[PDB]
Design a protein around this ligand. Structure first.
Ligand SMILES: Cc1cc2nc3c(=O)[nH]c(=O)nc-3n(C[C@H](O)[C@H](O)[C@H](O)COP(=O)(O)OP(=O)(O)OC[C@H]3O[C@@H](n4cnc5c(N)ncnc54)[C@H](O)[C@@H]3O)c2cc1C
Ligand SMILES: Cc1cc2nc3c(=O)[nH]c(=O)nc-3n(C[C@H](O)[C@H](O)[C@H](O)COP(=O)(O)OP(=O)(O)OC[C@H]3O[C@@H](n4cnc5c(N)ncnc54)[C@H](O)[C@@H]3O)c2cc1C
Lengths: 602, 602
């Protein structure tokens, strides 16, 4: 039965978090994408379960946060229990789970991986895309021809797929010719191995017992992230959806090795035993399960980074396939999902012919560095963050000053807000002076503005969706001053003139590429939406004001917050993934032109 | 051939706003409900456009506001245009659409009737209830037998239905025997007529042209609720979903009368003509349609109230079937929807055997009075609110002080928040002193509290859903003070004692009837959820604190806001529809017992 031969723009191998983020993003952008998985059915329970503040913001950009917040538990508060004068544990302190006053949502949310995936899968289905399964790649061939590798319309990747459960009569093999392929196939990536890419770092894997239960407990902080150190041992509570909690229990090599044949034997440790360890650690508080185990595993996990995150910018890897993090690093699946949020808009642009293929180099540049920074920080500084109290002079060989700086950095890693991309084609660190708070290469900073047309308030993030468009935020200054109004009008002419970047890169319909917004430093009492130049109000909703809502509950103070001189203004470019790409003065359109020129095709 | 004969607990005639609110509420409470409509398919458009603040709160109580707010346009801002000294219209003032600083959502939202209904219909379908259509009543019989009329398990209403388009094979006639029937069949209610109930009030009907368009206009306030008086006549903009607006245009008797034979000829008014009138009224601004009419009608509307809103508390009427309001009164379908939000929990309780049938008398008492109050206010004071500016000394024969008081009252009518039910079996106006802000008979006042267990903040309204339960809010005072802690414990034993109201009226599972919550006047630093008596923490989430969220963004100041002495505390009872039913001191449980005793069956 001859093998079937097909093409596709993007093939994704693996339908975990990274996979579904990517598939959804591509589907919502109307890209021709397929996604496969070797598992006959979707994961139902457990695994990754924490979502970070920045990741919530990202899901918001896709319209998916609403559902997450409706279904998920809020991990708002963390608590620390430690050995007591009397024996077993007492509470020493509590703190916000998240230390990040920028954050729109300054907490984590928890929910089982099955349910997180569902948010993406349901969105995918609505946009015409379904996981095909069970299927595995058996072979991956890639073109020698440099001309083919650099041609974004060639299909140089040939992936041979085997159907593990084909309809009777039909072939078990499909040979897919793809323009781009992504390996989102987890820590044991078949794709990574096939590409001949190493995983560099410590060879030590660590072992964690994990049980999800419905707790029978008088423990007061059962709904907090709780670090428990007892005479008997450590564990940690992650509160989950409803009344459920997860208990992580650190285990030893000893607990899992075979006294005879010295092999890793996971059957030595049962959930019953894990729970018995917890019971002891929680004394004098009770801890049992109301109804056995919702889920359990022995999680074996090391920290490593792939030596490369793409081959020829035609096959990529993402998530655990190219970097893994310990549970104590607090990353779960968050960096994995932000990898493909970074990748997809870039793939999208290349396929639409809007961006030169070289823009995809920025994926590895940005995301691989971040992964290394996480693990470099964990190695240097993780000893500080077990949740035993700092008692001593210069404890763990670091001063108070150095501890505070590390706790700050750590908080920025776990929130997901710290991500600071280095200069590249899509990150031009110039004119930072003009909006010192809107750090270039970091995500656009939440603040509320108000529409001139209808006085409705919006966080700026809500006007920066993941719609595969760049956003040009034109901070016009005090638009009521005739001089600054004339300035605004001049800039609008300039941007809409035929040779400008907007039209030259706009492919006959520039508003599909570039979303232009005004943000004027005046109040609604003095500005109607029609007062702005047409180019700054392409729709009536594009006219924002630095002003409060009608009941003075939100808004105002935006120019001050962002560090923008209200008398001069600035142009702030935000990428489709919501990161600030560059800044320029109102007279500095030529620098915006240079920005897009470094990666967009005419 | 032979007509089909069926039974049902509740039959609803009409699937408009009032109808679907009722059907959904009953479905969510697991009541056996059927609902019919004579329209072959669901409407795409209609009268309803505007949802008031209180109504949003109500949808929130069903979990339906989220979807409304996602789909609907926000009418945040109102504008007023009037004839200019020189000619043409000019803007005289702008203002918040809504005057209500309590309000959780201090604005109106707008959306087409089809889409509002959908929110309810999709919820209904998820709970196993579908509108049956097209069907009309042809006959309504009601029992003579007093014993049958007073028996909540008898079926004394016989409604004969005709199927306008029956499946082949089946009969075109069904005789439904119902326990309760509701007429939600509009201003020309067949049900009202059948019951022989008059509509009392002014005989004068007024005439309005209505057109929904996508405006081609340079009018600056096209996204505001705008009152426009021109030399040529008055009209009003209601902004709608997307770019759409609705224009209400006031007409004369002459515009629909025959210049010759003086007969009512409604064909003399076309949408084309209504738009031509708008064009003139907006001068010097432009106003045209981009693409014909989304919708239009001739709204003929008077203000009247049915002389009775039920017969024997077995057949009820609601919405336009028992009271109508002018467009300038600002009610749209909002009082209609709040009618059935009032009725359904009460029907529910009677059917579950939790309440005596006489409690249904409170429907007419509460909702008919509100309707009369609306129209009495409109007759006295509507001259003030055409949207013409106050230019003169003592204009319209009222002083500045009296004008301001009337504008305040009016704002409370249009917000929906002003509703103040008079004393009855379910409204005991006693101990008002102890929480002067929580007016008895008015809706529970929004304020944010924080859970002790996990520090998550919630508006109190979010802990008062429409789940057919009464809610007992026990404000415990300063729970950290030993004396007040002992007091709290004493009250908890009292409430959970075998002879108490809770058990005596709890029907073997009292938590299905009564939702008990704590609200302690202390901070999380000082109170874990386990510190409270068991009865005040039946679930860990029942323990609320008057404290801020972790970032001090919301919460605090609740006891002060409500007017409760933190040293003494109070019991506040909230009805299933979210209105405050009574208040009592912590030593006054006998008054709570008296409350429930006036209407609950043992
Ligand atoms: C048993 C188990 C326990 C875990 N416990 C925890 C925990 O306690 N805490 C925690 O934070 N994380 C845990 N995880 C891991 C968690 O899922 C990851 O840390 C995170 O989700 C990485 O996301 P990813 O997007 O890289 O893809 P993954 O979540 O790994 O998704 C990979 C997917 O690819 C599929 N796949 C693999 N190989 C192929 C192939 N050749 N062809 C096609 N499809 C393929 C798999 O079926 C899987 O569905 C656990 C994982 C497993 C398997
Ligand atoms: C054609 C039409 C146009 C309207 N246009 C406007 C407008 O432009 N602006 C405005 O402000 N208001 C308008 N209205 C009034 C509007 O219907 C209501 O004020 C509002 O939509 C909701 O109030 P309600 O829930 O009480 O009832 P309704 O919406 O009236 O719900 C009941 C509906 O069921 C149908 N029905 C009637 N008799 C029976 C029966 N015996 N059995 C079953 N179904 C029956 C009717 O079509 C009736 O409208 C219009 C009404 C109609 C019928």
């Amino acid at each position: 039965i001859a093998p079937k031969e097909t093409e596709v723009d993007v093939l994704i191998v693996g339908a975990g978090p990274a996979g579904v983020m990517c598939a959804n993003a591509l589907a919502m952008a109307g890209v021709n994408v397929r996604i496969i998985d070797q598992r006959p059915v979707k994961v139902a329970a457990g695994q990754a379960d924490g979502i970070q503040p920045r990741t919530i913001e990202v899901l918001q950009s896709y319209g998916l946060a609403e559902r997450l917040l409706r279904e998920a538990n809020q991990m708002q508060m963390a608590a620390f229990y430690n050995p007591s004068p009397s024996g077993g544990i007492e509470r020493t302190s509590r703190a916000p789970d998240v230390t990040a006053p920028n954050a729109r949502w300054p907490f984590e949310v928890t929910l089982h991986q099955g349910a997180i995936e569902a948010i993406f899968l349901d969105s995918m289905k609505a946009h015409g895309v379904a996981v095909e399964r069970p299927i595995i790649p058996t072979s991956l061939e890639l073109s020698d021809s440099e001309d083919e590798l650099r041609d974004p319309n060639a299909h140089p990747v040939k992936v041979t797929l085997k159907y593990l459960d084909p309809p009777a009569g039909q072939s078990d093999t499909e040979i897919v010719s793809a323009k781009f392929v992504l390996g989102a196939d987890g820590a044991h990536s078949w794709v990574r191995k096939a590409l001949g890419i190493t995983m560099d770092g410590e060879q030590t894997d660590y072992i964690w017992g994990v049980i999800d239960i419905d707790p029978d407990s008088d423990f007061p902080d059962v709904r907090c992230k709780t670090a428990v150190h007892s005479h008997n041992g450590s564990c940690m509570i992650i509160p989950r959806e409803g009344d459920l909690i997860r208990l992580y229990i650190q285990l030893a090599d000893r607990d899992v090795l075979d006294p005879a044949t010295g092999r890793v034997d996971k059957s030595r440790v049962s959930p019953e035993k894990l729970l018995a360890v917890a019971k002891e650690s929680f004394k004098p508080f009770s801890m049992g399960a109301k109804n056995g185990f919702e889920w359990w595993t022995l999680y074996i996990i090391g920290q490593r980074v792939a030596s490369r995150f793409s081959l020829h910018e035609r096959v990529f890897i993402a998530g655990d396939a190219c970097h893994t993090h310990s549970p104590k690093a607090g990353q779960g699946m968050n960096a994995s999902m932000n990898d493909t949020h970074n990748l997809a808009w870039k793939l999208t642009h290349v396929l639409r012919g809007w961006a030169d293929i070289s823009v995809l180099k920025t994926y590895e540049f940005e995301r691989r560095k971040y992964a290394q920074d996480l693990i470099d920080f964990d190695k240097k500084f993780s000893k500080l963050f077990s949740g035993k109290p700092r008692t001593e002079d210069n404890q763990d060989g670091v001063s108070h000053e150095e501890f505070l700086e590390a706790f700050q950095t750590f908080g920025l890693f776990t929130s997901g807000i710290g991500v600071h991309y280095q200069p590249s084609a899509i990150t031009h660190a110039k004119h930072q002076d003009l909006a010192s708070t809107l750090v270039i290469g970091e995500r656009m900073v939440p603040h509320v503005f108000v529409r001139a047309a209808d006085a409705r308030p919006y966080d700026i993030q809500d006007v920066l969706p993941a719609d595969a468009r760049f956003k040009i935020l034109v901070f016009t200054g005090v638009i009521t001053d005739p001089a600054q109004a004339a300035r605004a009008a001049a800039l609008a002419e300039e941007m809409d003139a035929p040779g400008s970047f907007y039209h030259r890169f706009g492919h006959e319909n520039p508003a599909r590429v570039f979303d232009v917004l005004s943000v004027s430093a005046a109040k609604k009492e003095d500005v109607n939406y029609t007062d702005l130049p047409k180019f700054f109000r392409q729709h009536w909703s594009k006219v924002l004001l630095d002003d409060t809502d009608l009941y003075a509950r939100v808004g105002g103070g935006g120019y001050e917050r962002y560090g923008i001189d209200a008398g001069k203004g600035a142009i702030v470019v935000v990428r489709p993934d919501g990161y600030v790409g560059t800044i320029a003065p109102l007279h500095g359109l030529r620098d915006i032109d240079a920005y897009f020129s470094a990666f967009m095709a005419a």
